[PDB]
Structures are given as C-alpha cells and as structure tokens.
Amino acid sequence: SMKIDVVTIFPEYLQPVRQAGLVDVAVHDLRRWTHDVSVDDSPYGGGPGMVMKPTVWGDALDEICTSETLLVVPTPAGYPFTQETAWQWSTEDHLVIACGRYEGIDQRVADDAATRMRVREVSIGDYVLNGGEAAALVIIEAVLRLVPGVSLLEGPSYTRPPSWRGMDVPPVLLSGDHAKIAAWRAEQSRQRTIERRPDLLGFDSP
Amino acid sequence: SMKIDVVTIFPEYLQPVRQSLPGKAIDAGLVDVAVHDLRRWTHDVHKSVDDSPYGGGPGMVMKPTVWGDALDEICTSETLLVVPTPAGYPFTQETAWQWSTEDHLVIACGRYEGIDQRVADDAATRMRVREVSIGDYVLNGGEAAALVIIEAVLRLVPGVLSLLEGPSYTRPPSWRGMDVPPVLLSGDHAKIAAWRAEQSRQRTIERRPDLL
Numbered sequence: 001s002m003k004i005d006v007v008t009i010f011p012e013y014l015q016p017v018r019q020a021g022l023v024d025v026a027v028h029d030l031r032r033w034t035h036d037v038s039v040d041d042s043p044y045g046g047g048p049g050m051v052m053k054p055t056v057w058g059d060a061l062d063e064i065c066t067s068e069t070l071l072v073v074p075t076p077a078g079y080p081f082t083q084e085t086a087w088q089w090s091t092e093d094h095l096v097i098a099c100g101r102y103e104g105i106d107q108r109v110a111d112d113a114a115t116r117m118r119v120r121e122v123s124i125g126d127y128v129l130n131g132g133e134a135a136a137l138v139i140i141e142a143v144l145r146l147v148p149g150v151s152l153l154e155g156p157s158y159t160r161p162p163s164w165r166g167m168d169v170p171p172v173l174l175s176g177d178h179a180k181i182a183a184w185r186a187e188q189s190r191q192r193t194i195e196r197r198p199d200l201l202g203f204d205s206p
Numbered sequence: 207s208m209k210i211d212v213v214t215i216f217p218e219y220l221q222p223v224r225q226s227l228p229g230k231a232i233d234a235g236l237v238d239v240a241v242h243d244l245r246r247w248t249h250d251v252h253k254s255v256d257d258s259p260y261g262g263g264p265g266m267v268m269k270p271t272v273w274g275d276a277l278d279e280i281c282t283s284e285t286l287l288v289v290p291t292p293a294g295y296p297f298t299q300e301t302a303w304q305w306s307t308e309d310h311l312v313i314a315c316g317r318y319e320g321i322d323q324r325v326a327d328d329a330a331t332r333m334r335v336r337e338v339s340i341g342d343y344v345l346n347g348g349e350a351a352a353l354v355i356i357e358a359v360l361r362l363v364p365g366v367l368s369l370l371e372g373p374s375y376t377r378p379p380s381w382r383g384m385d386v387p388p389v390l391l392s393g394d395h396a397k398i399a400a401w402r403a404e405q406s407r408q409r410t411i412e413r414r415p416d417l418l
C-alpha cells in the first residue's frame with residue numbers, strides 16, 4: 001500500500017498518471033498555500049532567473065508530510081535515480097514529490113524538511129527539464145511497476161510474420177531450441193551493451 | 207521551425223505537452239506537436255498492436271506491420287526517428303542540443319516488451335533512426351520518455367517553452383532558523399563566484415563522483 005503526493009504549480013501536467021487500489025496518487029497545487037493576492041523571487045548573490053521561495057513550500061509540506069514521509073525532490077543536481085532507487089522506494093508507505101519550476105527551490109526547503117523526515121534530491125538523467133513535473137511522472141512510473149501486487153541491455157525482439165519486407169526473423173528464434181535461443185539472445189545483449197552502454201561492463205564511455 | 211509527431215497507443219499521455227506550448231510560438235510557426243493513436247494503423251477488427259515473441263519468453267512484442275504502416279505515413283527521408291527503449295544509447299543534454307535544430311522529429315512510443323526490431327532496422331535504410339534511453343531505470347513504455355525528450359529539446363529551441371549547480375536562495379534572509387549564507391549578501395561578487403564554485407565542487411564530489 002503506497003500513497004504518493006505530488007506538489008506542483010502545474011497540477012494539469014500530472015494528468016498522465018491516470019494512464020488501482022494498491023496505490024493512491026494525489027496532486028496538489030502549490031499555490032493553495034499562498035496568502036497574498038508570488039512563489040518566486042530573484043536569487044541572493046545574483047544570477048539569471050528566479051528561485052522558488054521557501055515560505056510557500058514549508059507550509060505545503062507541513063500539511064502533507066509526516067516523519068515517515070520520503071520527500072523526493074527532482075533536480076539536475078540530484079543523486080542519480082536508478083533502477084536500484086526504484087526498488088528501494090517501491091516499499092515506501094508515503095512518497096511526496098516536490099516539483100520545482102523557474103531555477104529551482106530555495107535550498108532551505110530540503111534542509112528544513114531533512115530535520116524531521118528523509119529527503120532525497122534526485123536527477124533522472126543528464127539533461128535539463130523546465131521543471132520537476134516530467135521527472136515526477138518518470139519516477140512514479142518506474143516505482144509503481146515494482147510495487148508488490150503490481151546489468152546488461154535487452155536484445156532485439158520479434159513477432160509475426162516470420163518474413164516482413166524481405167527481413168527475416170533470425171532463424172534460431174524459430175528453431176524451438178531453448179539452449180540455442182538463450183545463447184543467441186545472450187550474444188545479442190552482449191553486443192548491444194558493448195556498443196551502446198560500454199560503461200555497464202566497466203569500459204570507457206564514447 | 208520544428209514538427210514533432212508522437213505515435214502511441216496512449217495519446218492522452220502526451221496531452222499536457224501540447225498544453226505546455228505557448229500560443230505565440232505556435233502562431234509564429236516555430237513548433238507543432240502532433241499526437242497519433244497507433245491503432246489508426248491496425249489491420250483487424252480487434253485493433254491488435256501486439257503478438258507473442260518469437261523464441262518464447264514473457265510479455266508481448268509490438269507488431270511490425272502496424273508500426274511499418276504508421277511510420278510510412280508519418281515519416282519522410284528528412285525525419286529523425288526517435289525510439290525510446292531501455293536498451294537505447296543514452297539521451298543527454300548533448301543529444302537534446304543536436305536534435306533542437308531538426309525540422310522533423312518522430313517519436314515512436316512502444317509498450318509491452320517493445321517493438322519488433324525490423325521496424326527500426328527497416329526505417330534506418332531510408333532515414334536517420336535513434337534508439338535512446340533516458341536513464342538507468344525501466345518504464346512501462348515510451349510515453350514518459352517522449353515527454354522528457356520533448357521538454358529537453360524544445361526548451362533549447364529559441365522562444366518555444368562538468369559540475370553540478372550548487373544551492374540557491376531567495377527571500378526571506380532568515381527562515382525557520384536558517385540564514386542565507388552571508389557571503390551572498392556581501393556585495394563581493396568575486397568572492398561569491400568562488401563560493402559558488404566551491405559549493406559546486408563539493409556537491410559534485412558527494413552526489414556525482416562519476417563526473418570527476
């Protein structure tokens with residue numbers, strides 16, 4: 001049984017989550033916790049863009065989080081989110097995902113939170129998004145498919161027809177020889193991993 | 207001026223991307239994102255998109271005949287065909303920069319165990335094809351990856367949307383007992399830059415030693 005709360009100034013962007021019982025996902029508009037008739041301001045020390053104010057975040061997380069909560073904060077500067085992370089988080093009772101926008105969230109939000117709950121700043125990959133929402137969708141998908149009750153690269157897969165546009169399915173896959181099929185698939189996976197992800201086998205990246 | 211076509215059995219998944227686009231960029235003809243239901247190209251009354259894997263094993267494989275027809279209609283020789291897959295080359299910021307100047311991206315979103323390999327291999331005989339992974343975790347299908355790729359690419363298209371960055375701060379100067387680092391309020395901008403550099407170095411050592 002898992003509860004996921006997602007906090008964002010763009011709740012509309014989290015709608016793809018509908019595409020249950022073991023898990024509940026709830027999306028909260030951060031602006032719900034503002035008192036004035038702005039969630040951001042210029043950075044101390046200077047620099048381009050805006051930083052999200054800690055005040056609004058503090059009030060939201062105060063209401064949503066408990067000491068048992070795992071607070072997840074997507075950020076390009078985070079620890080890497082990997083399959084290992086997904087397995088680890090798959091047995092959590094309560095994930096709260098704080099989605100930033102602009103140039104990110106005042107660092108004190110995570111620091112304050114860490115005084116009463118576990119906090120994980122994470123990156124989903126070495127590219128830059130406009131905000132945390134797409135990363136939340138990735139994290140939710142990767143985690144939920146591992147929830148109870150729900151290395152090397154995978155090689156190529158094939159299905160019918162056995163010949164298509166003059167391209168034939170590798171004959172071994174039609175042979176019904178499980179050992180020969182297992183061996184060919186291993187070789188394909190090895191080949192693919194060396195070519196595309198040599199780092200996985202402890203070799204230099206291109 | 208970029209056209210992005212996404213092909214998926216879950217077109218609703220891509221709807222927020224389409225709403226994420228500023229009207230001014232669309233009206234200026236800088237960008238167009240179109241989403242297509244793969245089932246438009248199915249052959250049968252059951253609208254089948256998958257079938258059992260040759261050689262056996264778990265799950266299902268998406269049909270080459272259906273995908274072949276879809277890409278035949280949507281792609282041209284100038285298309286960059288992007289195929290998310292856990293077995294792909296890594297998608298990075300460098301990739302995003304490269305793809306940001308493309309006239310036409312087509313993103314083919316798989317589900318189940320993926321797409322029959324002949325689809326990409328056939329397409330590669332007449333257009334540029336890129337199989338890519340967005341990170342070292344497994345998703346249920348290509349749609350979330352497409353969202354990530356579209357966002358990362360389009361935020362590099364003018365006017366459409368190393369070391370780690372260190373912490374950032376804004377008002378108020380004191381909050382829940384935590385003061386903004388005084389150096390940031392010092393007006394010594396050379397010192398501030400050096401402080402930020404050291405914060406960056408420390409964070410990179412702690413979180414991403416692989417970058418060093």
Ligand SMILES: COc1ccc(Cn2ccc3ccc(-c4cc(N)[nH]n4)cc32)cc1
Binds near residue numbers: 077102104128130135
């Ligand atoms: C100053 O450096 C920047 C800091 C933030 C941003 C945009 N942005 C704002 C909030 C936010 C949350 C997560 C992510 C993200 C995470 C990954 N792996 N890629 N992108 C990006 C985010 C741009 C630049």
Ligand SMILES: COc1ccc(Cn2ccc3ccc(-c4cc(N)[nH]n4)cc32)cc1
Binds near residue numbers: 319321339347348
């Ligand atoms: C047997 O190995 C598997 C094969 C496919 C799948 C699910 N699936 C189906 C299509 C598809 C497209 C992209 C991705 C993806 C990309 C990244 N970086 N993570 N996950 C995942 C995808 C699961 C496992």
